[PDB]
Amino acid sequence: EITGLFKDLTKVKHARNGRLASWDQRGKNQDYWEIPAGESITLGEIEGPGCITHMWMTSSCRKVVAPSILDPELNASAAPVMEIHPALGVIWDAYDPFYYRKALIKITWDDQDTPSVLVPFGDFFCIGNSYPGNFSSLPFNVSLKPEEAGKFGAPCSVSCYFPMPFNKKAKIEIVNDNELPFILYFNIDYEMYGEPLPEDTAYFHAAWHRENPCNGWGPELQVNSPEVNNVTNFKGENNYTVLDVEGTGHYVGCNLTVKHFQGSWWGEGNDMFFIDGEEYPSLNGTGTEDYFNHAWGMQRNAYPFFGTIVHEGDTDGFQVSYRWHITDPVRFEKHLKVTIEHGHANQLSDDWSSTAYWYQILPTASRITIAPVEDRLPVVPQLPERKLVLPQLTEEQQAARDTYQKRWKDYEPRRDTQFRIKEDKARRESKLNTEFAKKLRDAFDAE
Amino acid sequence: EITGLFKDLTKVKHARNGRLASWDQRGKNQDYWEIPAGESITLGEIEGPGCITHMWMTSSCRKVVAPSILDPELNASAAPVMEIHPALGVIWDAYDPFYYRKALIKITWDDQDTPSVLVPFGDFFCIGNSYPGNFSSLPFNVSLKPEEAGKFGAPCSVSCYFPMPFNKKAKIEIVNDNELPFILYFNIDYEMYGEPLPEDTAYFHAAWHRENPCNGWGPELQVNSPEVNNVTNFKGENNYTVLDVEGTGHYVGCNLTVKHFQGSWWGEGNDMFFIDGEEYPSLNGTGTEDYFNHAWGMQRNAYPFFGTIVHEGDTDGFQVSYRWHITDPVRFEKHLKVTIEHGHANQLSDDWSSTAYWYQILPTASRITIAPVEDRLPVVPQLPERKLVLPQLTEEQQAARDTYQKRWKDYEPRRDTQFRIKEDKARRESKLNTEFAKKLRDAFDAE
Amino acid sequence: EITGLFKDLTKVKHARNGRLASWDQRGKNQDYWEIPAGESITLGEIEGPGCITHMWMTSSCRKVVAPSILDPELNASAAPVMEIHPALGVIWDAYDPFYYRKALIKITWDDQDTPSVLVPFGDFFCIGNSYPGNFSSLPFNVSLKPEEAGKFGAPCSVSCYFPMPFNKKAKIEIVNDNELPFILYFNIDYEMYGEPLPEDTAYFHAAWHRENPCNGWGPELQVNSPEVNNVTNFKGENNYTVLDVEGTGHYVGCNLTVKHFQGSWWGEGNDMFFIDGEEYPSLNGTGTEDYFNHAWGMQRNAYPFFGTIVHEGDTDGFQVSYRWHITDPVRFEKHLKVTIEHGHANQLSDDWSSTAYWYQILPTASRITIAPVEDRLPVVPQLPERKLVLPQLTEEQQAARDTYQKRWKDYEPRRDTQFRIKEDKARRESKLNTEFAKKLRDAFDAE
Amino acid sequence: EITGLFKDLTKVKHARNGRLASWDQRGKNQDYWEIPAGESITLGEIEGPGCITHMWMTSSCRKVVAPSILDPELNASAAPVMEIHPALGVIWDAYDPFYYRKALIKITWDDQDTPSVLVPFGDFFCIGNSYPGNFSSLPFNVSLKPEEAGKFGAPCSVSCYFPMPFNKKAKIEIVNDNELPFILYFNIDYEMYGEPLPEDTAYFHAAWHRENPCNGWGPELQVNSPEVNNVTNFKGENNYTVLDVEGTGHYVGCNLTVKHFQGSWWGEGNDMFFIDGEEYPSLNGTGTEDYFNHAWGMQRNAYPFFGTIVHEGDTDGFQVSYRWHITDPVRFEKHLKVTIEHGHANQLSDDWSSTAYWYQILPTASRITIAPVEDRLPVVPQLPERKLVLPQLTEEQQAARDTYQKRWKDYEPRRDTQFRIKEDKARRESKLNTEFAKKLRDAFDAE
């Protein structure tokens, strides 16, 4: 019979495809949702049994900061995003830099009293620090244009091929903690089965964590000084914690965002895994790039199971890295703690954040929680306050300032109205998505 | 026991390798076939049960356009392709631009009356528009030298890892509709089994389609104008059809070649899938680059399951793209229609062509057809007619012209003879490949 | 039921993770082993049943060639490798060019009399010619910094994802035939099973070969001359031998290092596979780049299943290539001979070395040998003797020479002592690694 | 009243243009000279008064090493250089690596009993080490194709804009010390004057030197070690000598080729200029890159007055640099010694060679001499002796060798004949160039 990773293509399965999408249910060309400010919205609820097979998304979050000479009512029906340089003097929709950290993706299986995925939107899709990097790997990909790359909140395509099985229910939401709405395009593909999945079926989970600052004992000591390197750490009580979970399942990897402050090397710390409540780690690593399967630092490589998403050499002191344990998962029967020393022996006080991904049989024993939005924002240097004084104005300069202010007073409310109409579309299509997935479930089951 | 995508390497299978190849059966170094002009040639017939596991090919199609000072009899036994610049004055074997569209690959399973694969030779191997682009994906790859890249009919290496099972027969042919012969190297690897595959085994199919022009309602309206974007399309009656097939199986993706005429954006159109005869599509997409898992246009990325082969930004307005549904196949019990709006609500009148790939149980109920060769050629701009009138010639210039015409009269027929000899070798080795595959089948089965 | 290459993530397995690592068992930050000169060291022994799922390593081999103004006792506790340019005048730890060929990796299964893996350290990890190239493929990756690339013995991260099952025992050793010690970091991940693996389980094997020179009939004749191309070779008695193995299993590919001498093309030779003792090869290829799934030469491409690690165009005449037969393995019931013509019909006399990878049921019938160290070194051009005659020296020059020689006599033995101390840690941690793996085995089997 | 560097374009001069060129005096398209082996040839002799304003040249030197299937008599009339890769099997004209150092350019003014320019052909045109690099400066430029770059003896375009005035005579020669002829294209532009130049007119001079090895006191001591850096050198008696000349004039710069042996830094040595016989240098520099107006090493920059032609980072240990003193010339009334310490205080024993360029009033005091050809060749590493032995040959392999050897015995003399005919043209056109320059002089003087 047929063998290898393509073999399943050579046998038919009696499963029915479905898809949750931001498709324009008016039949028009607004195939995205305007996710409202300070709201949660359901991309869809699907009745099991089924499996999520693919997610694609993209997003934009602009703030209107100047009056436009583009008719704002007609402009709402043109392309979704005014990719127009502010130097032309005709419009200014500024980029919201941290929207990837202000929104969360939230997934709840089988009507549990906790989500199983609760990760900032960016970090889930391997955008760390609300700062995309172009890369491919086996389960996650980002396609980022060079014209957009190298800034906070750059638009880009994200895709996820991790399978997410569910016997009874899938509820996918976005939690928007932003004061701004944002545009979200999505295609969530799944298949529905005509019988239950086995009860030892492991469900997809993901959780996010941040230590900022890490509680270092020697942040002011030079990394790799003899004094630092001769400190011992066996038990790793103060290690950065990527994952700490009770259940039966397996860890399939992480992304790690590190903003490093001393300008040496943030990565001497060892991975240390604690399986099934052991006091001392049974899996001991050698270094943080070593865990990410690089060496002598991180490289500008992104390989199927590991590598760099954003390289410290391209930024103001921050790195985004990933490793996938797809063929080499870290299994546990009762408990797993995944840790990394934050510098050798937890020397350093850098800004670490992470997404852990794992599969486990239900139930999800502990609530997956997330730090509040004020705790999820990248650390960025800020310009000194620049309290400008206007010179003595000519009548002409005052008339220009007055005329501009008047245009702005008229224009902003007109754009606000258009955002509210699109938000109304998203809330309407949220309910239609679920209603259609229910009709599809029932028509499949009748068959 | 052993899990993950390498697990089948950890157990032995009592299956016998075979290979169809263009290997020189004189034992010499012409390990290619000269595929004759206007003929079909069988690369091999294999008696099942078995599975194609790997295909590699490369090719060259040169037209002799000037006399050479290279001895044409000896030249026939040197390297197969004279990669010599015309500026040297010694030979001129011009590139045939469109040979990848003029030749088809044709595969017939189990002695059916209809082929299951009928695709232009280029497009099958993800060469769109007879214009190769360097890329890797999980099932298909093209290795293209930068020296050869950016021209029609560039030589390059092609490789296909989609498995192709067959219980009774595999017959692989090249149909060459070209006025010219072409060089084909191939290695087609398979295994033979000592027992039948299950009768619900899904067999590999591929078909090709083109709409040139697409029947757009508004090709002269600016893409993304408010007027275009407020037109509705739910049922997709006039969508571009990628695949329209009757049977039980699953679609595994496509390549798509678009030549865009307006100079705006060709890709606002949504994928819309119609499963098992439903009137309205049950899978609704958001845009064409969104279907290819890019965003805000196509990017110069080629990832394992999707991306760009040829980028519009590198060409005279054409794009070649692909998506594989390997872990997220689109399944069907009775019928599948894969469609994409050609521009929003079928606004545009661009040139679209596509290869659809799918698996299905036999029999193949849909009779796969191909557009004729005159309908398969890229649309390219043509220089205006320049009606050169010779100046008054010196006798030395006339003598040069006559001497050159006499060398051409003597040379061209000597090249033709060498092509006829290689064509005879191709036809001979066609029969040998099938005889040897039969001997190997019978020797394997004799246990 | 869940299908495709990710499907094993959706089911839990009752297996216990272990890891052999160079972790610092003092709990400090020397998470590497100083592998002694001319010694074998056991990375670890693991009791089956289990499976190696992942290996990561990195390495350094420096030779102290000048006195340093860095305190050598304190230096031992700083970073492991002094990445300091000789031009600063403060230290000179020179790169040992060929340590990747001088050290072997050796793996023995189930306490057999013979190793199943015996390959130079570099070649095993797809470093050919002790000259790293940056690349990714599905089972092997090298992450090489551009600052280190383009030289012999460059440091880099290696990773292997080929699974290595074992019912009874795994013993992993480094055999260091170097006059110098070298730094090795490693993480070898595995899982332990609660029940035997099936008897038909195929075990991972690898073996290394070199022909330098190959026994060419025509090394001074131009490649692709008509005289070369009309020589016949059906039986391939004098072909380069990648693999010659007795048993039941399957070949999963090779790396090939070719130093080419005449400056034409080394790759006209066909792959010819001889299955189960057949006299003539049943699998006939077409060319050497063709076997590697490139065309018209090798390209600067590294794809999941094949390509270029080190390109001839970037070096002084040598190429490192690979092909993985993961979904298209070459199976054998009794015997397999993997050969490639060295040039068309074995014309050329180049320097060919290869690593063959295969799986087979035990016992290993074929005793795996390795050429001694003097036969493993890369062929490199050498500068002619420059017997320098000192000029007449001033008192101040003689005093500088004497002062420097004095600093060197004092300094070298102090560095020597620090190497010896690290070597004692390596021998200590070798035993500790095996003792912990045994404790872990026993606690898992008790549970 | 018009000012600035363009001002002379605004006034007419009653001067007559002339050109010495390799133009085909048959009127055909062989506009080059085949410079014979082991011969001198006069590019032209011009009667003064006049001034050389511009030289352009290019060249090729191929060695026939294999029989060709190109008709050699017809080939002589095609393009001049067969840019055909040896892998095609049809021709092999190998590159002669050191022809740039085997040929000299020799210029003699006013029938003096010494040339005033005697420099290897390459070095004069800022090709050091017979190894072109692409660059532009104000007086010299090299245009090198990237396809040809990175190899010894690469073809490229050279241009010189240093003015060369002469009151009575200019004689320009190539001295070909090579065993091989070479192709030379040239265009040498000049203007003739209707009155003598003032007798205090400074004439262009250039001379070449090499110290291989330099006579270092500490080649085995680490560069920038404290012991090296504390050695003193005020008087510079053992400094590398760029120029040592008696007369009245000014130095306008140099090129310098360094092959460095230690692998640290070759360039700590100071420039020291001795003007008018001074015991101690009056112009003291700081370092060798500092003299070339780089810092902390040489950079990949080539600026109007200084920089890098070939960067050590791109080669096997050698650098070619230049500096022009056009607005900042180093003047002398009686004598100039231009020196550079070869490493700090002449520590090092590297391979240094230089072209010095200067202007001086006549007479040239001392004969300009040049090291013989065996002393002009780049230092290159050599492959060990590959004492190949043929295997037992089949009758077919013996017949292939015999047929190839017979083809070679026939072919080589046919190519030799075509070289001899082209050499005859060069010797003929040498005389015609001087006869035409004389007829032009006399026609101008009559007018």
Ligand SMILES: OC[C@H]1O[C@](O)(CO)[C@@H](O)[C@@H]1O
């Ligand atoms: O990769 C090997 C080692 O390289 C380092 O960068 C050395 O300073 C460490 O973080 C790591 O363990």
Ligand SMILES: OC[C@H]1O[C@](O)(CO)[C@@H](O)[C@@H]1O
């Ligand atoms: O990727 C998101 C959207 O971006 C566009 O290019 C916007 O005009 C559309 O084709 C697509 O649906």
Ligand SMILES: OC[C@H]1O[C@](O)(CO)[C@@H](O)[C@@H]1O
């Ligand atoms: O890739 C096709 C063919 O290209 C060549 O380089 C032609 O000389 C051969 O090695 C190979 O068989």
Ligand SMILES: OC[C@H]1O[C@](O)(CO)[C@@H](O)[C@@H]1O
């Ligand atoms: O450019 C400043 C200095 O930089 C160096 O490379 C430093 O060692 C010297 O050769 C030079 O004098």
Ligand SMILES: [Ca+2]
């Ligand atoms: Ca560490």
Ligand SMILES: [Ca+2]
């Ligand atoms: Ca759309």
Ligand SMILES: [Ca+2]
């Ligand atoms: Ca061949």
Ligand SMILES: [Ca+2]
């Ligand atoms: Ca100095």
